Amino acid sequence: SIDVKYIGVKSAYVSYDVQKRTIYLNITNTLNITNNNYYSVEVENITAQVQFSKTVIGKARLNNITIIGPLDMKQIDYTVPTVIAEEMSYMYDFCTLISIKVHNIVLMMQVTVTTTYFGHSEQISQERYQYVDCG
Amino acid sequence: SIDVKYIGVKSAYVSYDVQKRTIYLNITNTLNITNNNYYSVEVENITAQVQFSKTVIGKARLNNITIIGPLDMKQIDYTVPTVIAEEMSYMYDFCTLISIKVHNIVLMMQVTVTTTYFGHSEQISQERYQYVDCG
Amino acid sequence: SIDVKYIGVKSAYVSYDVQKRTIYLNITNTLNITNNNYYSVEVENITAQVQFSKTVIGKARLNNITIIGPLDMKQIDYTVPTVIAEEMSYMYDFCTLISIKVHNIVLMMQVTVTTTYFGHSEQISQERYQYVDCG
Ligand SMILES: *[C@@H]1O[C@H](CO)[C@@H](O)[C@H](O)[C@H]1NC(C)=O
Ligand SMILES: *[C@@H]1O[C@H](CO)[C@@H](O)[C@H](O)[C@H]1NC(C)=O
Ligand SMILES: *[C@@H]1O[C@H](CO)[C@@H](O)[C@H](O)[C@H]1NC(C)=O
Ligand SMILES: *[C@@H]1O[C@H](CO)[C@@H](O)[C@H](O)[C@H]1NC(C)=O
Ligand SMILES: *[C@@H]1O[C@H](CO)[C@@H](O)[C@H](O)[C@H]1NC(C)=O
Ligand SMILES: *[C@@H]1O[C@H](CO)[C@@H](O)[C@H](O)[C@H]1NC(C)=O
Ligand SMILES: *[C@@H]1O[C@H](CO)[C@@H](O)[C@H](O)[C@H]1NC(C)=O
Ligand SMILES: *[C@@H]1O[C@H](CO)[C@@H](O)[C@H](O)[C@H]1NC(C)=O
Ligand SMILES: *[C@@H]1O[C@H](CO)[C@@H](O)[C@H](O)[C@H]1NC(C)=O
Ligand SMILES: *[C@@H]1O[C@H](CO)[C@@H](O)[C@H](O)[C@H]1NC(C)=O
Ligand SMILES: *[C@@H]1O[C@H](CO)[C@@H](O)[C@H](O)[C@H]1NC(C)=O
Ligand SMILES: *[C@@H]1O[C@H](CO)[C@@H](O)[C@H](O)[C@H]1NC(C)=O
């Protein structure tokens, strides 16, 4: 990337800013901007790019071959009992939460077994997480 | 990318901004912008790009071959009992939640077994997560 | 990257900023900006790039072959009993949470078994985590 910005509230290239209880009297503003942005970005010049994959087997014997790629999800148990009894009680559960593995962002890129590539790979993430607000 | 912006509330290239209880009297504004943006971005020049995949087998013997790619989802148990009894109670569940793996964003890109590629791969994510607001 | 910015509240290339209880009287502003930005960024010049993968087997004997890539998820147990009884009680659970492995951002890039590549790989993350706010 070139210019990544995280902004709290306000972005202003020029900000003539006024707020509460202000006497804005007798002001003279003269402003000139000559803004130039010039970009020559990610330019590629290749005369020759060769990509070659070759597998050769000559009368061989193969047995018990197992190939498993990344992210091998197997045989998991989740158990969350919630056994609640009462005897003459006043229950006040205002903001109570039960969350099993809640996901927000899952960006999977280049997850394979055999891979050959040429070039550029780029991932950008912005957010404002707030999980819980209870008053 | 070139220009990624996360903005809190306001973006303004020029902001003549006024708010509450303001006496905006006798103001003279003169403003000139000469804004130039020039882009030559991701330009490719290739004379020769070769992509070649070859598999050759000569009278070989193959047995018990298993190939499994990424993301192998198998044999999972989720158990969330919720056993609730009462005896003479006042229940007040105002903002109570039970969530099993709630997903927001799942961006899968290039998830295979065998892969060959040339070029550019790009992912951009913005959001404003707030899960729960209870008053 | 070139310019990564984390901003608290406000970003302003020029900020003529006024707030509460201000007497802005008799002000004369003269402002000139000649702003030039020149970028020649990630430019590649390759005459020859060769990528070659070759596997050759000559009448060999293969058995009990197991290949497993990264992220091998197997055989996990989670058990979170919640056994609650009462006898004549006043329950006040205002902001109480139970979270098992809640995920926000999972960026997976280049997770394979065999990999060959040429180029640029880039990941950018901004956020404002706040998990819980209870008043
Ligand atoms: C604002 O400017 C004018 C002209 O220059 C002047 O007559 C006036 O008195 C000024 N205002 C104040 C409050 O001085
Ligand atoms: C910008 O405008 C002001 C206004 O008078 C002038 O004096 C200045 O020469 C200008 N500059 C350019 C680069 O145009
Ligand atoms: C790519 O094009 C030609 C071929 O090599 C080269 O002369 C030129 O300078 C390159 N372009 C850039 C922007 O570098
Ligand atoms: C491995 O080979 C033996 C006998 O050759 C067979 O019993 C077994 O099932 C094989 N393994 C798998 C995972 O199939
Ligand atoms: C605003 O400007 C005019 C002309 O310059 C002037 O007559 C007037 O008095 C000014 N206002 C104030 C409040 O001074
Ligand atoms: C912009 O406008 C102002 C207004 O008077 C002028 O003085 C200045 O020369 C101008 N600049 C350009 C670059 O046009
Ligand atoms: C691509 O086109 C020709 C062929 O190589 C080259 O001369 C030129 O400079 C390249 N273009 C750019 C924008 O670099
Ligand atoms: C592996 O081979 C054995 C005997 O050759 C067979 O019993 C078994 O089922 C094979 N494995 C699989 C996964 O089929
Ligand atoms: C503001 O400027 C004008 C002209 O220069 C002047 O007459 C006036 O008295 C000034 N204001 C104050 C409060 O002095
Ligand atoms: C910018 O504007 C001011 C306004 O008078 C002028 O004096 C100065 O020469 C200008 N500079 C350029 C580079 O345009
Ligand atoms: C790439 O293009 C030609 C070929 O080598 C070279 O002369 C030129 O200087 C390069 N471009 C840049 C921007 O370096
Ligand atoms: C390894 O080989 C033995 C006998 O050759 C077989 O019993 C066993 O199942 C093999 N292992 C696997 C994981 O298949």
Curated annotation (Swiss-Prot), chains A, B, C:
Positions on the Lumenal side per record topology: 1-135
Domain of life per record: Eukaryota
Tissue expression per record: Expressed in the brain, including in the frontal cortex (at protein level). Expressed in lung epithelial cells.
Residues carrying a glycan: N26, N32, N45, N64
Localization in the cell: Late endosome membrane; Lysosome membrane; Cell membrane
Disease with which this protein is associated in UniProt: Frontotemporal dementia 2: A form of dementia characterized by pathologic finding of frontotemporal lobar degeneration, presenile dementia with behavioral changes, deterioration of cognitive capacities and loss of memory. Gestural apraxia, parkinsonism, visual loss, and visual hallucinations are present in 25 to 40% of patients.
Function: In neurons, involved in the transport of late endosomes/lysosomes. May be involved in dendrite morphogenesis and maintenance by regulating lysosomal trafficking. May act as a molecular brake for retrograde transport of late endosomes/lysosomes, possibly via its interaction with MAP6. In motoneurons, may mediate the axonal transport of lysosomes and axonal sorting at the initial segment.
Subunit structure, as described in the record: Can form homomers. Interacts (via N-terminus) with MAP6 (via C-terminus). Interacts (via C-terminus) with the vacuolar-type ATPase subunit ATP6AP1. Interacts (via N-terminus) with AP2M1 and CLTC. Interacts with TMEM106C. (Microbial infection) Interacts with SARS coronavirus-2/SARS-CoV-2 spike protein (via RBD domain).
Protein name: Transmembrane protein 106B
Gene name of the encoded protein: TMEM106B
